Design an enzyme around this catalytic site. Structure first.
Site, PDB file in Angstrom:
ATOM      1  CD  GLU A  27       1.856  -1.292  -4.944  1.00 53.07           C
ATOM      2  OE1 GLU A  27       1.705  -2.332  -5.601  1.00 53.07           O
ATOM      3  OE2 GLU A  27       1.987  -0.179  -5.486  1.00 53.07           O
ATOM      4  CE  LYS A  83     -13.855  -4.341  -8.644  1.00 55.32           C
ATOM      5  NZ  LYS A  83     -13.052  -4.501  -9.878  1.00 55.32           N
ATOM      6  CD  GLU A 134       1.713   5.368 -10.518  1.00 54.87           C
ATOM      7  OE1 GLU A 134       0.536   5.353 -10.109  1.00 54.87           O
ATOM      8  OE2 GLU A 134       2.581   4.559 -10.140  1.00 54.87           O
ATOM      9  CB  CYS A 193       3.284  -0.050  -8.422  1.00 51.97           C
ATOM     10  SG  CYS A 193       3.980  -1.703  -8.190  1.00 51.97           S
TER      11      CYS A 193
END
Ligand SMILES: NC(=O)c1ccc[n+]([C@@H]2O[C@H](COP(=O)([O-])OP(=O)(O)OC[C@H]3O[C@@H](n4cnc5c(N)ncnc54)[C@H](O)[C@@H]3O)[C@@H](O)[C@H]2O)c1
Ligand SMILES: C[C@@H](Sc1nc2c(cnn2C)c(=O)n1-c1ccccc1)c1ccccn1
Ligand SMILES: [Cl-]
Ligand SMILES: [Cl-]
Lengths: 494, 494, 494, 494
Positions: D262, D186, D393, D296
């Site tokens: 992750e 996906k 983040e 990331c």
């Protein structure tokens, strides 16, 4: 030869074990521990709850700190300590085998000859790995030097069942400690005693304080505190599917801790017409009846080719009629009790479903005795795939035997389950052994045997029987955390 | 489908290949290369000797220097180059299969469908390893950081036989180059042509100069210069036992270079009464007759249980009578010639010893044709263990069939040889397959098959069939040199 | 803490050890064993020769037979036996450290604290590997099941030097026995005593008879019989280059047995201007002077950057003037004797060559005492690359110190030797540590340390310092023989 | 050199890809796909939901069945197909780099030179592993033959983010397919286009139908259907912490599927006073600003030693002032837009929190342009540990710079986060490089560099940055399921 403890067992260790010292519960509460054979209380044990788990985790975290004795000691010395713990368990084998039997309803000869030997051998196996856990140097693209450290993960919460208290303790702590983790162990509420004895030996062996902490107590209290703890890096678990689900959810919602689970099975055997029939009967029988059927790997669906089916059923029934029930400490007793009321009730309910759903009762089918949670060894033939006894883990001495005629079809039936812990294949044909074992969605497939478990092999489930592997080289991976270190250099050479 | 080269083969590459350029011999001398089917000269090739080998080694040493393109390039790019060489061999498959057939007396359909496919697949396999050759980080005692580098060894001398010129070239250079070595290859004097074509493709693929150097020439001259060279780090060899011995001695006396050898076999098959008889007959037959019997793994002793022995002998004889001899390039030809006079003479001498020593000649037993080194396919039954044909490698189309009655005894007889390259076991019984294969002192044991060779498997001899392994993960070890780097640190952590 | 043996050492074991029993020599001859500190005979020992080696090999072969106790026992039990032998050596540590000192001229504190600890730790390391030696399952092309067995090789001949008698015995037998081999050990004629004591412990530990056989005796007799034996599968050796050459030749001419050698070194250190100077001085000093310079890894060429060279030479000289010579059993004695006359003569001859060739004598340069083979600790500065003391292994307390100004040039000089056992790099710079260590053609490179040897690391030479690796994961490969088993199946699945 | 597509990009592939054919959504609904630089719709794409995912899983399950082409084909052929897919991506590099840039707001030169090269190299890496995925043969206790199969797991659901659409697709499918799994991918709703192009190449390369299925659509619909699917064996995910939590819960409640995640980072750098200052500035800068900060691994906390802090801040600010914003397809443009409104809003909200919480704004701090989701490159100095910009983040071009004086303290501060994906260490000191990198709780630690990612290295998080590793040898473990096969034999031998 089966030696015995020459004086009565005296219970000494009943407290929470944190930083190599014995603590009372924060609350002050204690809980009873019973002998399933007599239904009598053996002693009271300190009841660990959230607050006690919080103390254990703090001790485990402190022992894992960079610069601490457990982090800085030689890997080989971590191994040395594990070999010493194994020497001490060997020293106290009679004591430990007796305590295991008495608390767990476990036949003494098996407790002494199998469980204790498995603990000792598994610890010695795990000791040998400690200074052989290695990373890599990697020929990365570009002018860099890249290596990996297979570090310990950190604080590992380890939630343990009641069917193999001591073996399950060693399966958990052996790999974790060999890799350099610290642990917070929660034994089954039914069976904390052998764990607390081993904690005494962990102290005596000289493990640094807080490397192993043992918090006896209950599942929704102490267990849930572990699963949901914001500073536990990994939880490992053996037990029910239901609790497994609770653990992963709690882990997911809290700190995304690493989770490994080993859950039930509904492990099938396939017996081909060419099989050594007596061998297949004896292994399938022990495969389902071992430890009152209270094994994750129980061979609880036995598919037999039509032409040998009636002979197989006949021989199996005569094998099941040979047991002697009673106190698991008495020589000659060959079947002890079930662990407790809840399991007792489930087994009997499932036996009744088998009768009501039209399975053929060959022998057994009811309770036994005036005391203890004893269930008669029970065999059902003509079992079909939609019966409750074909689908659900019984965890009792209840054997299901089924016929097949098509090998394609029976592989499909064997695989038609959400479980997948193990299976067995009985045949003399090389090609059939290989092709069938490859096609079965099961973590361990035995060929012409069953229930052969050793420290050198990885063990674990396919599908809803769990995730990850324990023991063997492969199992040690899941008690490490890989760190890649990549260093800029002026020029690399091959 | 078997496509063919649509125009006649034109030989182009006839020179020594050093630093990606074509050199004449230092002496100026050239030597003839023959077609074993016609006994006619195909061309002349530059004759390499000590002085030429010395040039190749200097080029190989320079290419291996710290800071050079081959040492500093990404491992993944070493792999890229090997995959490109495989693409080019695939491009020139028709050309190469034809040249191999013509020079080596090798059936074209096998040369095209097996040898060429094996070269291509083996190169692609070796390409995949290049950036997966890894060292370790090691939890050494004391406050140190220890890692290992699995470096290339350096300059590898590689002495190649005539039976599989192209396959043997790729088996040697693929692993060596993947690990980052440089090479000096000496093809068989009989069969230098396909090697020199591949050298052209090594240039075209873009390998740095001096990474692969090819010195055609003779054994006691060019070969001995390699074995005795003071700056060759390793010599790898496939061929006779005699030369193997010469190589290790020369290596020992010169610079103690690393030596790996693959030498003859006298590989036995054991056929049990329960074996699939047709399967065993067909695999044992191809096992001994493949490429005119000129395979190291030739199944040159076939032990068959008494009760099926006469049927086995009958079926094998009828299988051997079905060959069509002639030029290996002609479609439908199923047996080509032997490589040369020396081998031809040896085979015929050994056939005569078999007749004289009282073996039963079932078919064949003599030469064939007016031209070419053709030997009739020959079967001997009632062969006993002290006959020359039972003890010595024939390297010809000569099949030995023997009876046994005791399994203990036939394992002893199968193992009663200084050889040990391979063996075959034919049975339906699981236990017999496992126990027999474990007991045979042979590097590859096939079960219900024979001659199944793939790039993913290590291959090599027990005993005087050689030392070390080629291909597979394990084979790559012998093209590395391990360096331990141990760094003092202030404090280590796990 | 340094405990001592509280009564005088009594020598008991003086015979050949075969099939766990004590044999006289076939000839009846015995040979003297001396204490190098006093030049006095300690005892007589049975002199093994060809006939005795032949008995040992027969016993070793019989113990390796398929079906024998050593082949059929659990791998884990092979490990158990090795851990038991280590427990027994630990028990007899005082005895063994004393015997080692007395027979080998080895300082007692080092013998007790280093050698004995190394033996014990290395045996425990090797024990841990036994049931972790694993083969592979391999996804071969075609419909086959392929696995590999990493079997033991068989009978291993192991020829041992006099500089580390006990450590070298354990380095040889530990890996070999862990992998399931049987062994024929030939200790140095100078130092058989500790080996024969360990053989007594091999019996006591319960190793099956013929698994370890010990044949004391001389090199050209007993040693040559091992190297040339037609039924020894592998010979492993540590000692001189000359003998190494003899062994490979004898091996080549006899049965092409697998050979691994560890030979001399002329191991260089490179000390950069930015190095921690005291650290570099102390490690380089111990690097060359350890055990009277009688170490294969002796740091016998020390290259120091010009700007710190005179300071390095000054500090090193003052360090070398601090020794106390005498009997290695007396507390406070810091330098014992050389092993024997031959070594004594060689050292003194080489010292004289250094004076004659114009090296600068800083201290020492002659013999010491009225008795024992003592050599003064000797330092030479301004040594250049063509002097005998720069090129040849001295095996004495003789230190060579050299200046450099160019790093490219000194790497070339460090690599300009047929040797390559080890090297040392002293610097604070990350890039220089990595790039220099990669560029040195040496099997172990230490960074800011020297002589750090542990069981977890592979150890072995580049070039004429030998072939193969000992210890670590990697070392265990060379005590196995890989067998590929490939089984035809009807259909394979991933 | 930077070549460009010579005609305008025409979008062709807009449908769901199942069983190698193009399907409309079951519902019939489609959703828009935008260019973040212009805010204009590029096209409409079929919207996958539960019903479409159900079709994909059925196709993936059928392709994984025992006996199917994907299960029975040679491992080497699985590798062949992956190398072919890499050749095709290389063929369509211009097309794919352009589509990636246009759909993802990704600078074209990086898309072409980095992302496309990473896809190609990673596929070639994964191809090389296919026929090198191996199990073990294990020396189990007792008379048994035990091997392991490292089988594929089965149907793997793979949920992919928008920041590296193509790279993340290849990171997921490369390992999974190499190990023999089938996949249901996906892509991010923002960036389905490059995935659907690659699906066209999967067809063209000849992968069996249903091996790769691609279902574009939204997270709570298509994504949740994957996470909660009763017949998906494993879900792998890269994205937010929030969704990671949702996935593990859904997985836990449904079928206890294996989950690897992750998630974010708040990756710290530690810059020591002795660091190469320009090197540290340049790598830390690219470490935080790469791809508009949408990585990331973003180096979002930079700790600099006091004595060089002001110089570091000065040089970093001047580096950040050098960008040119605009359309990522135009040569010379050095910063493109953020992916969408949600991310744009978050970045700007966090920038405002930094101003309000008293961080020092050095440059930037607001939006840019009349169109596109552009944010000025922004630097904050004097950031403290409790500010939102220090804890959360950002996923934007927002750099945080901090001073430290104590190394013990700054390691604590660097580790004081629930994240742990990566870190960087800048120093010239060997000991500091090693000790600091060991102490950081981060999955990749770079030394004197940052953002060095290659296919040969495992990559993954400590703590709440995720679980498991991707790529490298180690990453391939998590796309296998280990099966132990243990066979009773009459007698085992070593
Ligand atoms: N690598 C090392 O650690 C090491 C050890 C000892 C000596 N050396 C070097 O070798 C030099 C000479 O010393 P050495 O003469 O005592 O060593 P050596 O090599 O002669 O002896 C070592 C072992 O080899 C055996 N040996 C001797 N001759 C043999 C033969 N013909 N066949 C088989 N085995 C034989 C010896 O009996 C002993 O067991 C030393 O000066 C030193 O430079 C190196
Ligand atoms: C005692 C050391 S060995 C050893 N230690 C040494 C040497 C010089 N200094 N030190 C401290 C040396 O040459 N050796 C050595 C090396 C190879 C062969 C023989 C001796 C050891 C430890 C740990 C494990 C097994 N061995
Ligand atoms: Cl292997
Ligand atoms: Cl290694």
């Amino acid at each position: 030869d089966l030696p015995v403890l020459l004086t009565d067992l005296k219970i000494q260790y009943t407290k929470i074990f944190i930083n190599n010292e014995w603590h009372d519960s924060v609350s002050g509460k204690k809980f009873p521990v019973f002998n399933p054979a007599t239904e009598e209380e053996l002693c009271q044990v300190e009841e660990g709850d959230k607050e006690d788990v919080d103390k254990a985790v703090k001790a485990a975290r402190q022992a894992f700190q960079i610069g601490s004795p457990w982090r800085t000691m030689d890997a080989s010395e971590r191994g040395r300590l594990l070999y010493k713990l194994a020497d001490l368990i060997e020293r106290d084998r009679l004591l430990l085998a007796t305590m295991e039997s008495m608390n767990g309803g476990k036949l003494y000869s098996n407790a002494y000859l199998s469980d204790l030997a498995g603990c000792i051998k598994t610890l010695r196996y795990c000791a040998g790995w400690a200074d052989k856990i290695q990373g890599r140097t990697i020929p990365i693209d570009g002018n860099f030097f890249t290596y990996t450290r297979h570090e310990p993960i950190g604080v590992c919460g380890q939630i343990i069942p009641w069917n193999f208290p001591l073996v399950m303790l060693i399966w958990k702590i052996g790999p974790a400690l060999s890799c350099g983790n610290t642990v917070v162990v929660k034994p089954a509420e039914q069976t904390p005693l052998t764990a607390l004895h081993v904690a005494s030996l962990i102290k005596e062996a000289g493990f640094p304080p807080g490397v192993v902490n043992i918090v006896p107590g209950y599942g929704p209290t102490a267990g849930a505190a572990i699963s949901s703890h914001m500073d536990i890096d990994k939880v490992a678990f053996t037990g029910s599917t239901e609790v497994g689900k609770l653990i992963k959810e709690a882990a997911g919602k809290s700190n995304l801790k690493r989770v490994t689970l080993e859950l039930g099975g509904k492990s099938p055997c396939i017996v081909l017409a060419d099989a050594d029939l007596d061998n297949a009967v004896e292994f399938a029988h022990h495969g389902v009846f071992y430890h009152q059927g209270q094994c994750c790997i129980a061979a609880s669906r036995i598919f037999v080719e039509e032409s040998i089916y009636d002979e197989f059923v006949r021989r199996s029934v005569e094998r099941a009629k040979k047991y002697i029930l009673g106190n698991p400490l008495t020589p000659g007793v060959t079947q002890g009790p079930q662990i407790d009321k809840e399991q007792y009730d489930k087994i009997l309910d499932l036996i009744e479903s088998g009768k009501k759903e039209g399975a053929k009762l060959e022998c057994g089918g009811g309770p036994w005795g005036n005391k203890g949670y004893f269930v008669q060894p029970t065999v059902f033939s003509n079992v079909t795939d939609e019966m409750r006894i074909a689908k659900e883990e019984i965890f009792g001495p209840v054997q299901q035997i089924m016929k097949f005629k098509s090998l394609d079809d029976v592989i499909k039936r064997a695989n038609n389950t959400f479980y997948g812990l193990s299976a067995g294949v009985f045949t003399k044909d090389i090609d059939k052994a290989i092709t069938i074992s490859s096609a079965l969605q099961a973590g361990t497939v035995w060929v012409n045997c069953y229930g052969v478990v050793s420290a050198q092999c990885p063990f674990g489930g396919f599908k809803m029987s769990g995730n990850g592997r324990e023991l063997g080289e492969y199992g040690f991976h899941e008690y490490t955390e890989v760190k890649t270190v990549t260093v800029k250099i002026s020029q690399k050479n091959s």
